[model samples]
Target: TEVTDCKGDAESSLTTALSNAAKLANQAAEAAESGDESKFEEYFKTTDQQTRTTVAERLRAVAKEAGSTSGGSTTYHCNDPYGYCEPNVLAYTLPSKNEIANCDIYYSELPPLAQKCHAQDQATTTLHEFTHAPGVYQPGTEDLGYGYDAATQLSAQDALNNADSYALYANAIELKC
Candidate 1:
């Protein structure tokens, strides 16, 4: 998990794999050596990586099997493999820009598993909103990280946790899920 293909097996058959792994290992070690609280998540959150990538890929696979569009987006939905779009932030259009959205559009209606694929499709400086959030590549992922304090408004609190969301809870939540 710390190395090699995030979607593959035990080891690679390629002879160059060893050399590449060695190089990568040394680099990661150097970065870890100077680690601090600030470096970990100062501006914020998201270890948060890889997990979303795995989730996205796995969701797509399952969504295909389900043959439905509950939340939106697809494993291989785009026509040309890549596209340009109106620049925008979580909307139907970008604000005063050439940006477009070849993505989005209820891209995540295919159940919770297949949901958020389009959300992760965002990348670039609102210039080249091509495709891919992060993980479609490395141990990469598109997670911004989320946690719950379990507010009292939605739950009775106490012995219960994550009870605010049926998705986070068990069985179901009512109209939410």
Candidate 2:
């Protein structure tokens, strides 16, 4: 009868979700390195949306098991209890100056079901952000926002390519976890 307990099910589901996420990351890396714009675009599209959604869903499921309602206003506000759910943008004020890019892993805001999930996501996100810190061709060129940019201008395009490739590498590492 003890086997009927569903606690294990939740843990197992979380593990599987993370595993799939890792696979996505690896594919993203390979695509980015192919020097094919269309291929990189396809991979970026899937990785960006799927990774964020997967993380949010896993966190939400964990919260549900904690006896918390997930769709209500209160539930939405519950994200980032420790202010960990920061935006995913990398901002740079000056080209020659080193700027600290801030990112939030959203683990602290996750429901109780993901008590162990925060650290992993945080570590992954941190690595991703750090990857963008270097090889920035121009300080002000990264203004297309997070994710990938399709700017046709030479400088903007170069920065976009570098950032996208770096992100792919970092994300691949997270997926391996």
Candidate 3:
């Protein structure tokens, strides 16, 4: 189905993914707030407490805003044809001040067959897109790169700034989907 025609199971799945993503973001925020150096390192692989705190707060905001009844700044489009058909593209935040997210077919696939952590589970994919929201990360924040290898190889500064880093880190905490 197209992004504009989302209904029935597609809509329900999207809603459920958003809710679950918020939960994961909150969990990541809590972990960052705890000041556990090892946990922080394991999650984002960085010791910059200041950026860590910012990441935590941003994630918290994404969770709150995405779950808000008043409609948040970010907008999620389900299975947009433009990006949905691209090979290996799971989702993308459009270049409109990062307020629009087009979740690709890979992300909208229900009953995801992923057996790995930080894979294309709906929650993880949604969380990745949520991180791109202007209301979540700062307006200038860039995606930097994608994929597990790219996500894992970010510099200290880039890791804190990358969208997928936050999603992967939040889902990395022993939660194998």
Candidate 4:
């Protein structure tokens, strides 16, 4: 009845998600490193190049740690069996450092429609949670909400420091339509 292990599909979904996140992080990191702003500007609007680069670097580090096989601090689990773990929240990492709590939809076969821009797949969800885990970013980041509208609403600093912003940006870049 309590939180347990993630097996079968859940585990595989997580693996695929993390793999995709690694690719996304690498893409963003390279873009930032080369001073490319096209993709960054798509989600995080009205931001300077430096802020985008800083956030990209943070995301790159998070990807590295998450994908590490040895001494990796970040932990992911299919703990929440119930769908209503936290109101509308699909996953979270607030209480535990470098830990993510995957709610019901985290492993759902159908992509959740949490946002209109992207399908909100496991990769994006995982990446979003990763950005919130302490030490993923040197100083950490915040949940300023989700979706492109929310991304554009934040101040340049807040957008750069927002968890959803990076996730959504990567999603937009990968799944542009």
List model 4 lDDT by residue over 1-177, tens digit each.
012357777766666667777787776666656644666665666547677668768878867855753346676666654333775677877535566768766666435323345557777777777778666666567877577777768877778778888777766665553
Better of 1 and 3 by lDDT: 3
Model 1 segments beyond 4 Å from truth? Answer: 1-33, 43-82, 89-137, 143-177
Ranking by TM-score: 4, 3, 2, 1
Query: How much does candidate 1 score in TM-score?
Result: 0.18
Tens-digit lDDT track of model 1 for 1-177 = 112112222122111222322232233223223323232121112223442233233323222222321221212222112343333332121223211232332222112221221122111111111112122122222212212223222322221111111112111111122
* Stretches of candidate 4 exceeding 4 Å from the true structure: 1-4, 81-84, 109-117
Q: How displaced is residue 94 in candidate 1, in Å?
A: 20
Model 3 per-residue lDDT tens digits across residues 1-60: 012335456766667777777788898888777846675775467767786788788888
Kindly give the number of clashing pairs for every candidate: 22, 2, 0, 0
- What is the Å distance of residue 169 in model 1 from its true position? 33
Whichever of 2 and 4 has more TM-score, that candidate is: 4
Ranked by lDDT from best down, the candidates are 4, 3, 2, 1
Query: Candidate 2 lDDT, tens digit per residue, 23-111?
Result: 43444444444334543343234334444333233223222222222221111111122333336532212223322222222333323
Residue 45 in model 4: shift from native, Å?
A: 3.2
Point out the worst 10-residue segment of candidate 2 by lDDT. 72-81
- How much lDDT does each candidate structure score? 0.22, 0.31, 0.65, 0.67
